[PDB]
Amino acid sequence: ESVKEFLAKAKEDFLKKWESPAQNTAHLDQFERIKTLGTGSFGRVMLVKHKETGNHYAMKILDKQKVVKLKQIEHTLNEKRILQAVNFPFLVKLEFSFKDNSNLYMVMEYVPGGEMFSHLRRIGRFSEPHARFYAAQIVLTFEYLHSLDLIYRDLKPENLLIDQQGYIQVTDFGFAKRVKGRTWTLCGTPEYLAPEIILSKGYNKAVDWWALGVLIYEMAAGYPPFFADQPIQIYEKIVSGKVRFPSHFSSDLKDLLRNLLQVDLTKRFGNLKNGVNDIKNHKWFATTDWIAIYQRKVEAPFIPKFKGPGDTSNFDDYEEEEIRVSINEKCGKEFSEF
Amino acid sequence: TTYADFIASGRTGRRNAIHD
Ligand SMILES: CCc1c(C(=O)NNC(=O)[C@@H](O)c2cc(F)cc(F)c2)ccc(O)c1C
């Protein structure tokens, strides 16, 4: 198989970078601040313009002290170490990274089309062919990531950006981890957690395949398979072993989803002897040309409205706050390898 | 309808991750 060999060469390049990560590849003054694109508890994402090239980028700025307070040191180090080492068509690229007295900076490619989340909510739901086009890209991305011993752990429409060709660009490697055995961290988004995560069990890459079932259901239905007003209520629905499907779902889609949203780990698609091939060879994907999807040769169902290289209409507005850089170095030892 | 019940819920906006 040429997929097996593509993956062999992809692991060769990844391991060299994983072992000798790039550090300090730019500095703040090389960038001009334009607008806040997003905010989080320990950081924010800014639209910025690179002075030397005129290129626009999405600069993620993390407050080191807030990362330390939230016990996300190791997760942040994983995120940067992984991002600088990976290379795949459906992943947002890390262009530069650096740190100063106060913050960590990850300069990513800017995807002006916004999150799938906004388009999905506005439209209501995607047709089966539209959902299939997006899902196929996640299938190939997880096959790529998992082959590098990486678990992604944060699949959701909020983390899937739509590029100018209408293809997905996966963002947020905050929970990504290189692990060969099982792992135990309680992390992810309530609607998307596999039962083994909720039940505090050791888990592996099968949680990403469960999250794919949640994503495909949400794209095709317009709502998640398990939802409620509070997370505990969502968890009780996830572990119950029951899923209801809208009447408009095709028999092939329901069959695929029963195999992905499988509470039993020995029966979950992507986790069996055939691995990812049980998904790729499923009836719902019969129409999918996996190589054409990878090559970006398939016509996209939706092309976002292009109104300039640095336009921001596909993103909400946020209060424009100061980027403070202290005169004293904060948390130096904790982020030494960043 | 299930759609109506979702739209009237408090979880139709961008969903935050759990850390703990
Ligand atoms: C604005 C969306 C976006 C992201 C993005 O925001 N990716 N998401 C993340 O990193 C989240 O982990 C995150 C968000 C945050 F606002 C603070 C945090 F600290 C973390 C990345 C690259 C992009 O071209 C675009 C258009």
Q: What is the DSSP string of A168-232?
A: EEE---TT-EE-SS-B----B-GGG--HHHHTT--B-THHHHHHHHHHHHHHHHSS-SS--SSHH
Chain B (1-20) residues lying within 8 Å, Cβ to Cβ, of chain A: 2-3, 6, 9-12, 14-20
CA angle A316, A322, A325 (to 5 degrees): 135
Q: Tell me the HSE value of A73 on the side-chain side, using a 13 A CA sphere.
A: 11
Minimum distance, in Å, between the CA of residue B2 and any CA atom of chain A: 8
Indicate whether residue A162 lines ligand 1 (CB < 6 A): no
Rounded CA-CA distance A275/A52 in Å is: 45
Query: Mapped to the 3 state alphabet, what secondary structure does A23-49 carry?
Result: CCCCCHHHEEEEEEEEECCCEEEEEEE
Cross-chain Cβ contact A174/B17 below 8 Å: yes
Which of A117, A190, A224 minimises the CB distance to B18? A190
Q: Looking at chain B, which residue has its C-alpha nearest residue A67? A: B19
- Let me know: does B2 contact A223? Beta carbons within 8 Å: yes
Could you tell me the CA-to-CA distances from A34 to A50, A55, A169 in Å, in that order?
11, 12, 22
Q: Say if strands A168-170 and A103-109 run parallel, antiparallel, or are unpaired.
A: unpaired
Domain A21-114+306-336, second-level architecture: 2-Layer Sandwich (3.30)
Instruction: Report d(CA A65, CA A35) in Å as an integer.
Output: 23
Q: Which of A238, A246, A280 is nearest to A138 (CA)?
A: A280
Query: Whole-angstrom Cα distance, residue A193 to residue A216?
Result: 14
Q: Are A124 and B4 in contact (CB under 8 A)?
A: no
The residue behind tokens 């969903």 is B15
Contacts 24+ apart (CB under 8 A), A35-44: A35/A312, A35/A320, A36/A318, A36/A319, A36/A320, A36/A321, A37/A312, A37/A315, A37/A318, A38/A315, A38/A318, A39/A318, A41/A66, A41/A70, A42/A66, A42/A67, A42/A69, A42/A70, A42/A72, A43/A67, A43/A103, A44/A318, A44/A321
**Residue A113 assigned as binding residue:** yes
Residues near A1 by Cβ (< 8 Å), separated by ≥ 6?
none
Would you say how long chain B is, in residues? 20
Can you read off the two tokens belonging to residue A152? Answer: 């992604």
CATH for A3-20+115-305, options being 2.40.360.20, 1.10.510.10, 3.20.20.140, 3.40.50.2020: 1.10.510.10
> Residue ranges of the domains in chain A?
3-20+115-305, 21-114+306-336
B17/A189 touch (CB, cutoff 8 Å), yes or no: yes
B10 contacts A229 by C-beta, under 8 angstroms: yes
Find out whether A148 is annotated in a ligand binding site.
no
* Count of Cβ atoms closer than 10 Å to residue A30 Cβ: 15
**Which atom number of ligand 1 is nearest to the Cα of residue A114?**
26
Contact A189 B12 (CB under 8 A): no
Angle between helices A206-221 and A251-260 (to 10 degrees): 150
**Structure determination technique employed:** X-ray
Strands (E), A101-176: 103-109, 150-151, 160-162, 168-170
**Three-class DSSP category at A126:** coil
Task: From chain B, pick out residues whose CB is under 8 angstroms from the CB of A231.
Answer: 18
Q: By the 8 A CB rule, do A31 and A97 touch? A: no
The answer on whether A170 is annotated among ligand-binding residues is no
Sequence letter at residue B3 = Y
Say how far apart CA A38 and CA B3 lie, in whole Å. 28
Q: C-alpha angle with apex A182: A178 to A185, nearest 5 degrees?
A: 80
Q: Which two tokens stand for residue A239?
A: 């572990």
- Report d(CA A205, CA A115) in Å as an integer: 24
A19: helix, strand or coil: helix
Q: Which residue has the tokens 């980028």?
A: A57
Contact (CB, 8 A) for A194 and A211: yes
Chain A's closest residue to B7, CA to CA, is: A223
- Say if residues B12 and A121 touch (Cβ distance below 8 Å): yes
What's the token pair of residue A3?
């997929």
DSSP output for A288-308 = --HHHHHTT-SPPS-------
Token look-up 């029951």 returns A242
